[PDB]
Amino acid sequence: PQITLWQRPIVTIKVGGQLKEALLDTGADDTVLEDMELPGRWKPRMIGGIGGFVKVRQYDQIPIEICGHKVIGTVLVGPTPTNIIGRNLMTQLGFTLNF
Amino acid sequence: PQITLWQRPIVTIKVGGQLKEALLDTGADDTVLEDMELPGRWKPRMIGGIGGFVKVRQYDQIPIEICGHKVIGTVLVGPTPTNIIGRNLMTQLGFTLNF
Ligand SMILES: CC(C)CN(C[C@@H](O)[C@H](Cc1ccccc1)NC(=O)O[C@H]1CO[C@H]2OCC[C@H]21)S(=O)(=O)c1ccc(N)cc1
């Protein structure tokens, strides 16, 4: 499908048995979700956003359902203005930018 | 053209007489560039993201060349860690996300 950008490109995700909304974010290398419970162990990760650097929780190999597709990969959990699906998972979906 | 997301989608822009590299950012509502001077009036603004908020100056109706194409719109200028082309300008090039 094709998604224009007059409004935020928000999609429904299913992660950790929870239905949420998230921003398709080509400016994000990594996927960052607001605080939630995920299984398994996490490791520390520091990410640099527009406001500076933040400690987040890195969970690896996490199943997420996005746009009718299952992806599996690294999900960072931490204080973010909004859930963001970064390039690590958008590539799993085969997203490209087109003009 | 079609731009991959395996790497950050960076493109060359021309703005304020100056050539720069910028991140195509579907996750960014507005275009924000690293501190520079732009002609005309501006209004102070705060934008929030991963690390918190940054204070920027908002210039309206600023001409920018992106991917060889001339567009106009709002440009926020401030202490962002990188130049970001937001949705407000990407729409004007008919940019879409496709999968
Ligand atoms: C958090 C989003 C809702 C908004 N951010 C846009 C987003 O694309 C930023 C854009 C961005 C890009 C680089 C540096 C700072 C901000 N990326 C980002 O925070 O990514 C972090 C998560 O993965 C990592 O990969 C890149 C940085 C890390 S934002 O930069 O804060 C932002 C907010 C408002 C406007 N107008 C413009 C930009």
CB atoms within 10 A of CB B21: 11
Q: What is the CATH number of the domain that holds B24?
A: 2.40.70.10
Question: What is d(CA B54, CA B35) in angstroms, rounded to the nearest whole number?
Answer: 12
Count of domains forming chain B: 1
Determine which of B70, B85, B97 to mutate to test the interface with A (most A C-beta atoms within 10 Å).
Answer: B97
- Resolution limit, Å: 2.0
Identify the domain containing residue B65 by its residue range: 1-99
Residue A71's Cβ-count burial label (10 Å; 0-12, 13-18, 19+) is: buried
Residue A52 to residues A49, A71, A73, B2, B27, Cα–Cα distance (Å): 5, 29, 25, 31, 17
- State CA A50 to chain mean position distance: 17
For B16, residues 6+ apart whose C-beta sits below 8 A from its C-beta are B36, B37, B38, B39, B62
Report the nearest-CA residue for atom 10 of ligand 1.
A27
Residues of B with CB under 8 A from a CB of A: 1-6, 8-9, 23-29, 32, 47-54, 67, 80-81, 84, 87, 90-91, 93-99
Could you tell me the distance, in angstroms and rounded to a whole number, from the CA of residue B37 to the centre of ligand 1?
A: 22
CB A66 within 8 A of CB A18: no
